[PDB]
C-alpha cells in the first residue's frame, strides 16, 4: 500500500515536563524525526518534501498538536491522578490501496494498549480491559469535543491522505 505512518513516544517524568521522540515513514522510508523536550521540540523533514511555506504550516500544526496532547495529559492527571514517570505511545496514519483510505490512531500507556480512534463514527474506544477512572475520564474528554473527533478525522482522512498522494 501507499502509507504514511507517524509514531510519537512521549516520556513524562512529571505532568509538566515531557520528552518527545518520534518519526514518520512514507512508503516505508523514514521521512521525519521528532525529538526533544516539550519546550523546544525539534521537528525536521529529512528530505525537503514540503516547500518552506507548506513546511512552516505543517510544523506549526504539529507543535499545536503537541500542545494539545500535553494539555490533555495534564488535565487527566489534574482530575484523576496519573502515576509518573510514564510513557505514552501514539501510532497513527493513513493507508491508500492501489479512492478509499484506511486511517488509525492508537494510544498506549507504559507499553499497554490504552485507547484508540474509531474513524467510522469519529469516536475513541477503550483498548484495555482494565477499568479505571483514568480511561473513563480520558475517553469522556476525547469524545466530548470536535477537536478530538471530527477535526482529527479530517487530519487522518484528508491531510494525511493528501500528503501521501502528493509525496509518495
Ligand atoms: C503530516 C506531515 C508529516 C508529519 C511529520 C511527523 C513528525 C513525527 C511525529 C508525529 C506526531 C503526530 C502528529 C499528529 C498531528 C495531528 C494534528 O495535527 O491534529 C490536529 C488536531 O488533533 C488533535 O488535537 C488531536 C489530539 C489527540 C490526542 C490523543 C492522545 C490521547 C491520550 C492522551 C491522554 C492520555 C492520559 C493517560 C496517560 C488537526 O490538525 P490540522 O492542522 O489539520 O487541524
Ligand atoms: C509506568 O511505569 C513506571 C515504571 O517504568 C511506573 O513508575 C513506578 O511506579 C511505582 C508505583 O508508583 C513506583 O514504586 C516506582 O518507583 C516507579 N518507577 C520509577 C522508575 O520511578 C509508573 O507508575 C507507570 N505508570 C503508569 C502505569 O501509569
Ligand atoms: C532544549 O532545551 C534544553 C533545556 O534548556 C535549558 O533549560 C532552560 C530552562 C533554560 O535555562 C535554557 O536557557 C537552557 O538551555 C537544552 O538543554 C537543550 O539543549 C535544548 N535543545 C536544543 C536542540 O536546543
Author numbering: 8 to 105, 108 to 177
Excerpt from the publication:
EPCR is a transmembrane MHC class I-like glycoprotein primarily abundant in the vasculature of large vessels, but present in numerous cell types. Structurally, EPCR shares a notable degree of homology with the CD1 family of receptors, including the presence of a central and extended hydrophobic cavity suitable for lipid antigens, flanked by two alpha helices lying on top of a beta sheet. The presence of a lipid bound to EPCR is key for its biological functions.
Crystals grown in other conditions yielded EPCR structures in two novel space groups, C2221 and P212121, containing 2 and 4 molecules of EPCR per asymmetric unit, respectively. EPCR in P3121 and P212121 space groups present strong and continuous Fobs-Fcalc difference maps that suggest a prevalent diacyl molecule but a more ambiguous head group moiety. In order to assess the later, we mapped the atomic displacement parameters (ADPs, also known as B-factors) in all space groups in which EPCR was crystallized.
